[PDB]
Amino acid sequence: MATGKIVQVIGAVVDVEFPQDAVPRVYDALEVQNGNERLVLEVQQQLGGGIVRTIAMGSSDGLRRGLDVKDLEHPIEVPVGKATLGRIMNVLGEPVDMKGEIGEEER
């Protein structure tokens, strides 16, 4: 399920409000469907009641207010080990070299 909703978008800074039982922690990763695409947000500050200020790890365009946001209950976490040798990856550990999935055991 997706417990949060976007309440502001100002450039790259997105505010999301959750029910006060389930506010993400700091540096947690959220996830939202930016149209026909996926966008992850990193929580920077827990400010006020249920609301959380985040940085978008991608282009912010196309974001509406009110979209459903889902919190991955863990920080951004990337593949590691021998599987990554010879690959190119972005900050999120996704391959940007078109050679397909990484094949990692552990994150």
Binding site: V26, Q44, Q45, Q46, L47, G48, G49
Partner: protein, 62 residues
Amino acid sequence: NSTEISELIKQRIAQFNVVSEAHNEGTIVSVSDGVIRIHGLADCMQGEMISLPGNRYAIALN
């Protein structure tokens, strides 16, 4: 009605059990960049040591 009003307020507040902190206690309402805002602690004193969950301390400055 001036006084029975206040009595009805106190009664209905006890009914719906909205309640105030203990004086030596409070709840975190914000977290940011290394600072927290706490709500309550009516008897916190400037410079005191506040004990967090996980056996850690915060220093009351504001």
